[PDB]
Amino acid sequence: SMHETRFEAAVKVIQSLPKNGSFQPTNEMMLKFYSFYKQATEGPCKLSRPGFWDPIGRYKWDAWSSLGDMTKEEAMIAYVEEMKKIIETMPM
Fold it and tell me: Which family is annotated?
């Protein structure tokens, strides 16, 4: 599908920024990207929240859980739209 192809292209773009540029998305933005990636591929968050002692686990889970019943296609659209917005503002 058009959205699935766009999604794969976008994922590649984001993956490449910490490797091929001098600038990358913020940690906050990376968690947002993770949330849409999970929602697009695995669907809605299923598991219980990690414990207080696992910060990155908790930040991850909170971001993914936040999306609720977002569909897989909506999460692909969201990921792509977020990537476009970052690329529009960020020196490459």
Answer: Belongs to the ATG37 family.
